[PDB]
């Protein structure tokens, strides 16, 4: 939020990122309401907006563009993260017979062009390959990503949901450094803390971005009563809500996780940055971890 | 078949490899009938024959030998892949009490000597360690494999069913490059596409060989209705049977998979190269992948 | 362990190690009894004693201390392995709210001071981080472990229960080589032989230490009757007990496993080196492995 994180020389994000994956599903997709969402973020020092070609059935970037095209200079205040690689039978890909992945140079280039056109800008700050593609030609995808960096259309490149072997294979075909891996991380999604996925990034000194950093709402919806009670106690102790403590749990990790919080609620945007005020000591981090997992550490 | 693949400077195979593991299950195991199978393969440009010490209860190599010895000049037309490391209590290994692995210098050397005598040749083109041995002394095995290449008895060495860490360990003890990993891959066996086994080989630029490329029979059993519908549809569309589409699904992967097709059926040998006639686009590869894993891609 | 194993230029262990995890469970924790246990080990050339700060609720090192202080120069006859990183609410950490890990320089330094004071020595031979810590700051932990070696308080450093990726992350932050990884390995815990954990150490030429080589007793529980029957049959053939054959199974592996046997029974301590007299041929190793996995090898 106020804290800023250098993914590289050429890219600095806000430590908390605003996720736009539901921006299209709001009743109000007016340029004024989109500007309002972005301004509420910027008021908390949240400058990084997370997009993808696929969001809102390939319309979410165009809804954001409504905002930026209407408000000159708003784009220069934000970092835009987008993604490509999923072809789902929706919007401009509604003729697809099956959901599939496409990491071809041709598809990456047309997805970036559509991103630039829909959002009304000549560059994005970060492009991620959205999913690991079991049919990837790493030589073709890596050259495509390197060419987009060399063109200035993309400031930096990364991946999402990649396993270490997928990250290694694509990195082995590239001159540019992949600057992040956007992966699912929360109190409810802790497998990467122990299974090698996070250790791999830490050793590479790569910050992950965490999607569904609250566990997609499942924290609050009745299967994590113990974890909830602890989050509410700590929240009452430090004057913040359970949500702020759950995000602070991610921020405490030395891998320097960048949480992506994707919400249409202007109330929950306004408190988004409260996690930076939480103090999360080692013992409290293990308390929350062992409540969520339902077993003491070995 | 038509197409050839360089595993190294020293070894080139046919892109489709004839699997001889059932050679001893045929009612007829006569020299003439073996020459007939080989000649049926050579007619298609399928020059590579896949053997193992253990095939046919340690008799398959002797049956191939019947053919090669009766026709002196046939061997110069083919590449012979053989394997060792499994000791089953069968044939010349009747005295073993338990099925076990043996990767000792002495066992490898005696296995190769028997392959050379049984097939009536002074060399094999490719020797594989048949299974990863939980009791492997990598230094001893690696030294023995390097010596066999230096002697000219074996043109190149590879492994079979190795995990990446098994491959890494053995390669660390050897001067010669392991040229392949022969692993199960098919629309019924897709784990290597996502679990790091194939990414490892793709990053190292090692072509896998794929055994049971049709599920060793189970794909056509009618348990996989959705998958066979698409294979049969695509086959009808391109004038080939379902089995040629299922092999073409492997050939479409950019890791340059080398399928091994095992059959005694002269008609199925005559049509074995039809897989190379199939054109399969990315979307169709994912249609079949999707049908095979029984759910949408993430 | 007449046989000795160099883990480094500065550290040699006995091939069999006496684990003291149970030393606080004995009704008798008197100095004379502790000396009797050490003396029974030394009579057989077992010189290495395995400790941890946490054993006996943070009292086992003090119990060993009682024996060593009572017998000047006994400490110069042995190697002491200890560990830190686990904070359970017991003994001097009874103030802890929850079982957690602590790999901070502060905790490591205080734990090592408590080890040296309780055991009455100015150094330990080997210090292990006891468990992989999801909150590890590898830079901080690594500098702390290197500082301890440079001070002379620790001759060598290692880890315990680390996955290969945890081992790799910590090693990347250190100048000294981690000299071992103390992992569970037994005829009832065989996953590391196939899952990449042993292969990683074998490729790095790092001897693992094996803890619970008898499953902490579970091997004799009744759920492993087939394994036990074979162990007693082999034991009777060679004039040793089931324990000796189960440990000889670990000793047979080419990765030079160092088994850690924890018992308070003076007659079992007195035969602990019998494992080194067992002849364990490849077929017998695979007989016992086949019993461990419950099916023939693939």
From Swiss-Prot, chains A, B, C:
A single GO cellular-component term on record: cytosol
Keyword tRNA-binding part of the UniProt annotation: no
GO MF annotation: an example: oxidoreductase activity
Enzyme Commission identifier(s): 1.1.1.432
Active site positions: 55 (proton donor)
The entry's keywords: Carbohydrate metabolism, NADP, Oxidoreductase
Protein residues bound to NADP(+): 21-22, 50, 160-161, 182, 212, 214, 216, 262-264, 268
CDD domains: AKR_BsYcsN_EcYdhF-like (cd19092)
Reported induction: Induced during growth on sulfoquinovose.
Residues at which D-glucose binds: 55, 99, 130-131
Pfam entry (one): Aldo_ket_red
Reactions it catalyzes: D-glucose + NADP(+) = 6-dehydro-D-glucose + NADPH + H(+)
Subunit structure: Homotrimer.
Family classification: Belongs to the aldo/keto reductase family.
Role summary: Part of the sulfoquinovose monooxygenase (sulfo-SMO) pathway, a D-sulfoquinovose degradation pathway that enables the complete utilization of all carbons within sulfoquinovose (SQ) with concomitant production of inorganic sulfite. Catalyzes the NADP-dependent reduction of 6-dehydro-D-glucose to D-glucose. Cannot use NADH.
Protein known as: 6-dehydroglucose reductase
Organism: Agrobacterium fabrum (strain C58 / ATCC 33970)
Gene that encodes the chain: smoB
């Amino acid at each position: 939020a106020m804290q800023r994180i250098a993914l590289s020389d050429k890219l600095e994000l806000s430590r908390i990122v605003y996720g736009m994956w539901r921006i299209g599903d709001d009743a109000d997709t007016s340029p004024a309401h989109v500007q309002a969402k972005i301004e509420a973020c910027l008021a908390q020092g949240i400058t990084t907006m997370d997009q993808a070609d696929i969001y809102g059935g390939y319309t979410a970037e165009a809804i954001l563009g409504g905002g930026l095209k209407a408000a000159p200079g708003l784009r220069d205040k934000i970092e835009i993260v987008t993604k490509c690689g999923i072809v789902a039978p929706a919007g401009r890909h509604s003729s697809a017979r099956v959901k599939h992945y496409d990491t071809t140079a041709g598809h990456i280039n047309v997805s970036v062009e559509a991103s630039l056109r829909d959002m009304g800008t000549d560059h994005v700050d970060l492009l991620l390959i959205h999913r690991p593609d079991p049919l990837i030609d790493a030589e073709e995808t890596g050259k495509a990503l390197d060419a987009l960096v060399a063109s200035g259309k993309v400031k930096a490149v990364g991946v999402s949901n990649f396993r270490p072997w997928d990250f290694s294979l694509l990195q082995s075909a590239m001159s540019n450094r992949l600057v992040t891996n956007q992966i699912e991380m929360s109190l409810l999604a802790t497998d990467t803390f122990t299974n090698g996925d996070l250790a791999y990034l830490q050793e590479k000194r790569v910050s992950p971005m965490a999607w569904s950093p609250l566990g997609g709402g499942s924290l609050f919806s009745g299967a994590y009563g113990g974890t909830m009670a602890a989050l509410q106690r700590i929240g009452k102790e430090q004057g913040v809500d359970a949500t702020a403590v759950a995000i602070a749990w991610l921020l405490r990790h030395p891998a320097k996780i960048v949480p992506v919080l994707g919400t249409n609620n202007l109330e929950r945007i306004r408190t988004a940055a409260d996690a930076l005020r939480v103090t999360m000591d080692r013992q409290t981090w293990f308390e929350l971890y062992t409540l969520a997992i339902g077993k003491e550490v070995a």
